[PDB]
Design a protein around this ligand. Structure first.
Ligand SMILES: Nc1nc2c(ncn2[C@@H]2O[C@H](COP(=O)(O)OP(=O)(O)OP(=O)(O)O)[C@@H](O)[C@H]2O)c(=O)[nH]1
Ligand SMILES: Nc1nc2c(ncn2[C@@H]2O[C@H](COP(=O)(O)OP(=O)(O)O)[C@@H](O)[C@H]2O)c(=O)[nH]1
Ligand SMILES: [Mg+2]
Lengths: 441, 55, 439, 50, 100, 51, 116
């Protein structure tokens, strides 16, 4: 009955989908063909896989995912790889030419050709699903496809489906390292469009994950696979309460509702704990107090901004494994009794707690050790506003000379939209200021 | 000792735009709240005067 | 899918494109017959980007070799990979240009242009979704500098939105082999700045210097020059031919590399260049690759970038690496030499990674940089053109073909305004806005 | 020269205002806590007669 | 400039003492609410506790303004110090073969 | 020429390039023009329809 | 054309329970009774008579394709709770800027809730 349909867009979307779907198949017991390991009866159950997979005639399972991209090679790799016979051919949608780091190309010219086909495929998947819980949408703010076509898909998805949740996993630009020069323009223009068509977001930048992997997992030269595994672990802990039973289960709509205080503040920051290697794991007790203390370290957030530069407004907290409510409450009380963690005034009780039984599985060839208990964290705070200020800094000092804008205009987008988007981000920053203010009369 | 404490540059065109969110009930509360906000600007941390107290 | 049509003009174009096709044939596993004898599957998955299918499991290159004198075409056809080219694509006149740009452009190139447009239309209509054209020529000659510009001007009109690269051989001023070289250079750069997407400026003197001091060859012939240039041309589109961790291609590079349409001249470079003992003593790593890439003795143009501000920089890496080392090194090189990058563009560097290493190697990297120091070549061309065109010397050859005199004047004017806007972007300040935000 | 002239006058006031505001605060609490003892003596005194 | 940073931390340490004092006073009034209703009758010492609060709020201000004038001077000290070194390299640059 | 002014001036004063409608028809990229395929109404609205 | 009501069985036919997860057509809950018989309002081959009135809307339905929809589609969810006085106006102007989207069958019909 539970149902999340995946709408992964872009190169980042496709690679994150590869990691997540390998994790899901290993968790549920699927083999790379798409079969159960035996010739088991369809009169048996373990139908938990129904939240992600769909049954066919032959007793085979098909994912509820639509990898979309506008360059052929990334999806040709998944067509040719080990999981080739797992995905339906018609689900993996590609295009002949890509936007090439151009939101304008990906929004008005190239995206508008493949809007209809992917909409039809999502419509068929939603037809298959019985009680649809939500749409999970993964993309980046730098790449032209994953910015422009994702924005346009969101805009049309809001029309086609008014109520349903559209969760947003996003790759935010890092404060220092960058794989692009024009990416402030994309990262400026996509958020102005998706400000009014979005429910929750989980922006992550790769620099902080680089720091976490180099500091905790003892890998001095990891690769994007090692980041994708961590992202897949985050999504797994999000959907665990849907999949398997728990002492206090929590849907998607619950932690959507208790995380967005105002209609233009929908930007939480993730956190996972513990992330430690086997050699370190052999030496440390891993208890609820330890992991919940590690979740609040400003050296563990995968967004390069310190919560000590702001105030938390909401905190969704997701425990998993061999955990006990009494110890959870003791740990949260200890967290509360600390001045280094500061809350806003109109949020006296700012926690939403969920508990799941099954420990997270371990993928062979991964990085993490096998641990009996873990925790995910989704904190909405105003310490994100400095990141928006830095993005405005870079966008303004590029936009003064009117650089790179000939590309967009020649594609066919008006130039006043640049000014309008920058003004709306200024308005959003001032909104963050106003909700950060305290009132004492 | 390097002494760095400043805000990243923004163009004066995009300034002075009013906010889109109005939360406080009355402007009488708003002005007092923002006045009290201005005063801690030498003791707040990070940037944009939104941190926790220094020390 | 995403095809490239290769224009080849002049003797320079023919020899360097011959080496270029040899390099890609060895990279993709092609025998002198033309068949595929490779072992890996990725070697024949996207081979349609440059090749076309022929019966017997044959692949014919998507190349157009154009020349006004038949003597070069014989050497190209009798070379090592000579018979791979389809004979109908060879297009050649019967009379040369004599290093006369006017002869190549107006009188004699006007007859070959119809047939070569027919052949390039043949090859453009063959492919389904053509990305564009990549042309190879020299500016100090008679046909590549001459009728090559006519080709560029006509096919820009016929196929506007497609991409065009030009691997132009510019004149070195320190060493030269032609007296009338400045005239052709200045009458060609105007056509380049008006109708071209990207231009890579390669200099034979720079290549000679690199072969002298880096590879330490006793005898540097033209083969090594062409091999270096062709390695660069392969490193540009390797990410289009092969999959990687972070993909990119030519339009991505152009969009993130050209801030305004007038400034499209780049200095290229190749990272792993070592001799015998150098190979023995040197461990091929990412920081060493970045260090040698940014060493100014490694550049293959004739302009030191310690005399200019690096407008934008691109690196396309080759092999299987860890992206943390790549990004850390590029942040390090951005922070250290702080003054050498313009300040009104944060993160002036654009990166790409392709998995397949070049054949014979475990890692490699390619640099494409736009800096203002490239105006050092236009200043030198303009001075040597002033000294010549002042006295109306060698002018009867050009004016006998039927051109007027104001063409030199307007070419020099446009060249001068190009370098003027380059210096305006040179001495530009970031924390300042005016004259456009008055509204 | 100008900032050096400006600095020395400024630095003394920061040190001078530091000690006085430290000194004033301790005077506030001693007088205030004395009155609480002054309320204690009367309540103990009335308790005797009760 | 170096002297100013320690004068900056010296005053900020006192600002916590001003802040700690404001908690001490408000803590006491809560305990002053614990007394039974016979003792709950307001007295003169309650006015003194209110008198302590107004001062600490006003003493908070002088230390608040203490640092705001400290910051603006401290930035101007940096820029002059910055450009002074910048200008030094200009004249030092033509003596590079000299002893200097 | 104050090229920084002119380059800004050419961008700000101008119009977009209108894209022609194109639709993709298959799980791999297949661009087709939309105004002649018969998906767009075209002939029904124009002309002396029914006369 | 019309969507009737299965009365006590209308729970089985509701759009979400039929796995149609989108905006759906409304259902006529009450039926009125007509007395007497019916006049003829069309010629042969279904031509409406000169006297009978006709609707003025489009005779070919109302679909809006991708290349016909506006470039800035406003959201369905409009919740004017904490918005300022002008900001609620500006969003509402964006809602009502394009009447052809609202009248379109595929077009959005947004709900507006709260006030500044
Ligand atoms: N964490 C993570 N980030 C990625 C991954 N792939 C790409 N990115 C980020 O995405 C940004 C650019 O978007 P891409 O996904 O690379 O490319 P795209 O989304 O297809 O957009 P186009 O290239 O214009 O077609 C880069 O800055 C990368 O840092 C990935 O696999 N993992
Ligand atoms: N780098 C390089 N330069 C070359 C090559 N062949 C010729 N040149 C240079 O090109 C110039 C002559 O070009 P030219 O033959 O006149 O061009 P054409 O008249 O169009 O055929 C000479 O200065 C040579 O140094 C080559 O294979 N590589
Ligand atoms: Mg891409």
């Amino acid at each position: 009955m539970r149902e999340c349909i995946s709408i992964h867009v872009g190169q980042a979307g496709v690679q994150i989908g590869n990691a997540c779907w390998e994790l899901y198949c290993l968790e549920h017991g699927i083999q790379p063909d798409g079969q159960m390991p035996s010739d088991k009866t369809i009169g048996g159950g373990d139908d938990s896989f129904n939240t992600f997979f769909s049954e066919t005639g032959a007793g085979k399972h098909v994912p509820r995912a639509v990898f979309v991209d506008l360059e052929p090679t990334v999806v040709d790799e998944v067509r040719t790889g080990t999981y080739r016979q797992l995905f339906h051919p018609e689900q993996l949608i590609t295009g002949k030419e890509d936007a090439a780091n151009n939101y304008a190309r990906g929004h008005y010219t190239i995206g508008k050709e493949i809007v209809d086909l992917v909409l039809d495929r999502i419509r068929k998947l939603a037809d298959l699903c019985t009680g649809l819980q939500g749409f999970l949408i993964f993309h980046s703010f730098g790449g032209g496809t994953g910015s422009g076509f994702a924005s346009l898909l969101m805009e049309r998805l809001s029309v086609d489906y008014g109520k349903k949740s559209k969760l947003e996993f996003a790759i935010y630009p890092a404060p220092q390292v960058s794989t692009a020069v024009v990416e402030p323009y994309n990262s400026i223009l996509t958020t102005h469009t998706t400000l009014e068509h979005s429910d929750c977001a989980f922006m992550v930048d790769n620099e902080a994950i680089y720091d976490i992997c180099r500091r905790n997992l003892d890998i001095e030269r990891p690769t994007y696979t090692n980041l994708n595994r961590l992202i897949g672990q985050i999504v797994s802990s999000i959907t665990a309460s849907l999949r398997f039973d728990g002492a206090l289960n929590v849907d998607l709509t619950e932690f959507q509702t208790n995380l967005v205080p105002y209609p233009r503040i929908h930007f939480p920051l993730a956190t996972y704990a513990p992330v430690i290697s086997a050699e370190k794991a052999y030496h440390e007790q891993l208890s609820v107090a330890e992991i919940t203390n590690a979740c609040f370290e400003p050296a563990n957030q995968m967004v390069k901004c310190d919560p000590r530069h702001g105030k938390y407004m909401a905190c969704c907290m997701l425990y998993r494994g061999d955990v006990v409510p009494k110890d959870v409450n003791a740990a949260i009380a200890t967290i509360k009794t600390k001045r280094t963690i500061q809350f806003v005034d109109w949020c006296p009780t700012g926690f939403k707690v969920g508990i799941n039984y099954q420990p997270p599985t371990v993928v062979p060839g991964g990085d993490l050790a096998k641990v009996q208990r873990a925790v995910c964290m989704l904190s909405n705070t105003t310490a994100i506003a400095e990141a928006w200020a830095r993005l405005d800094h870079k966008f303004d000092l590029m936009y003064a000379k009117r650089a790179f804008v000939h590309w967009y205009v020649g594609e066919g987008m008006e130039e006043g939209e640049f000014s309008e988007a920058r003004e709306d981000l200024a308005a959003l920053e001032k909104d963050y200021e106003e909700v950060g203010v305290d009132s004492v009369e | 000792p390097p002494v760095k404490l400043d805000a990243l540059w923004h163009m004066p065109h995009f300034k002075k735009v009013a906010s889109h969110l109005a939360t406080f009930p009355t402007e009488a509360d708003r002005q007092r709240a923002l006045k009290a906000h201005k005063e801690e600007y030498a003791v707040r941390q990070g940037t944009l005067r939104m941190g926790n107290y220094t020390h | 899918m995403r095809e490239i049509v290769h224009l080849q003009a002049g003797q320079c174009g023919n020899q360097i494109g011959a080496k270029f096709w040899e390099v890609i044939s060895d990279e993709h596993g092609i025998d002198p017959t033309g068949t595929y004898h490779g072992d890996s599957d990725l070697q024949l998955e996207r081979i349609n980007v440059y090749y076309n299918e022929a019966t017997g499991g044959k692949y014919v290159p998507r190349a157009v070799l154009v020349d006004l004198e038949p003597g070069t075409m014989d050497s190209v056809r009798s070379g090592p990979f000579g018979q791979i080219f389809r004979p109908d694509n060879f297009v050649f006149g019967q009379s040369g240009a004599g290093n006369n740009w006017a002869k190549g452009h107006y009188t004699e190139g006007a007859e070959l242009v119809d047939s070569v447009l027919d052949v390039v239309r043949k090859e453009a209509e063959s492919c389904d979704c053509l990305q564009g054209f990549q042309l190879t020529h020299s500016l100090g000659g008679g046909t590549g500098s001459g009728m090559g510009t006519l080709l560029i001007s006509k096919i820009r009109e016929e196929y506007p939105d497609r991409i065009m690269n030009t691997f132009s051989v510019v004149p070195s001023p320190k060493v030269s082999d032609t007296v009338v070289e400045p005239y052709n250079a200045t009458l060609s750069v105007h056509q380049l700045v008006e109708n071209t997407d990207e231009t890579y400026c390669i200099d034979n003197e720079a290549l000679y210097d690199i072969c002298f001091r880096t590879l330490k060859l006793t005898t540097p012939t033209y083969g090594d020059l062409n091999h270096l240039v062709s390695a660069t041309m392969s490193g540009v589109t390797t990410c289009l031919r092969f999959p990687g961790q972070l993909n990119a291609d030519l339009r991505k590079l152009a969009v993130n590399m050209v801030p305004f349409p007038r400034l499209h001249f780049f200095m290229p470079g190749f990272a792993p260049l070592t001799s015998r003992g150098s190979q023995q003593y040197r461990a091929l790593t990412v920081p060493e690759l970045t260090q040698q890439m940014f060493d100014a003795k490694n550049m293959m143009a004739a302009c030191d970038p310690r005399h200019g501000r690096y407008l934008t920089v691109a690196a396309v890496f080759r092999g299987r690496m860890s992206m943390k080392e790549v990004d850390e090194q590029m942040l390090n090189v951005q922070n250290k030499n702080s003054s050498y990058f313009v300040e009104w563009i944060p993160n002036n560097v654009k990166t790409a990674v392709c998995d397949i290493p070049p054949r014979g190697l475990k890692m490699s990297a390619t640099f494409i940089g736009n800096s203002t120091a490239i105006q050092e070549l236009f200043k030198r061309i303009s001075e040597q053109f002033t000294a010549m065109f002042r006295r109306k010397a060698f002018l009867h050859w050009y004016t006998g073909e039927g051109m007027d005199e104001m063409e030199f004047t307007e070419a020099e004017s446009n060249m001068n305004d190009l370098v003027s806007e380059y210096q305006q972007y040179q001495d530009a300040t970031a924390e300042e806005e005016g004259e456009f935000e008055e509204e | 020269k100008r900032l050096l002239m400006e600095s020395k006058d400024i630095l003394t006031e920061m040190a001078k205002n530091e000690v006085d505001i430290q000194n004033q605060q301790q005077e506030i609490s001693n007088r205030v806590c004395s009155s609480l003892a002054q309320k204690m003596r009367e309540t103990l005194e009335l308790k005797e007669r009760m | 400039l170096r002297l100013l940073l320690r004068q900056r931390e010296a005053t900020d340490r006192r600002l916590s003492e001003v802040r700690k004092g404001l908690l001490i006073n408000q803590q006491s009034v809560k305990l002053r609410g614990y007394r039974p209703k016979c003792e709950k009758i307001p007295d003169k010492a309650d006015s003194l506790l209110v008198w302590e609060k107004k001062e600490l709020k006003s003493m908070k201000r002088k230390m608040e303004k203490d640092m705001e004038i400290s910051e603006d001077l401290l930035k101007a000290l940096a820029s002059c110090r910055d450009t002074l070194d910048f200008y030094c390299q200009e004249r030092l640059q033509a003596v590079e073969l000299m002893n200097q | 020429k104050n090229f920084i002014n002119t380059n800004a001036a050419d961008v700000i004063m101008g119009v977009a390039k209108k894209p022609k409608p194109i639709y993709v028809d298959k799980r791999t990229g297949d661009k087709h023009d939309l105004e002649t395929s018969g998906l767009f109404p075209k002939y029904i609205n124009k002309k002396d329809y029914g006369i | 054309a019309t969507n009737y009501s299965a009365n006590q069985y209308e729970k089985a036919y509701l759009p979400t329970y039929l796995q149609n997860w989108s905006p759906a057509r409304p259902t006529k809950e009450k039926i009125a009774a007509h007395e007497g018989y019916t006049q003829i309002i069309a010629n042969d081959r279904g031509h409406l008579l000169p006297s009978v009135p006709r609707s003025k809307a489009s005779p070919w339905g109302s679909f809006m394709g991708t290349w016909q929809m506006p470039l800035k589609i406003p959201p369905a969810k409009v919740t004017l709770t904490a918005r300022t006085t002008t900001a609620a106006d500006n969003l509402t102007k964006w809602i009502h800027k394009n009447p052809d989207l609202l009248n379109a069958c595929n077009g959005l019909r947004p709900e507006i809730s709260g006030k500044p």
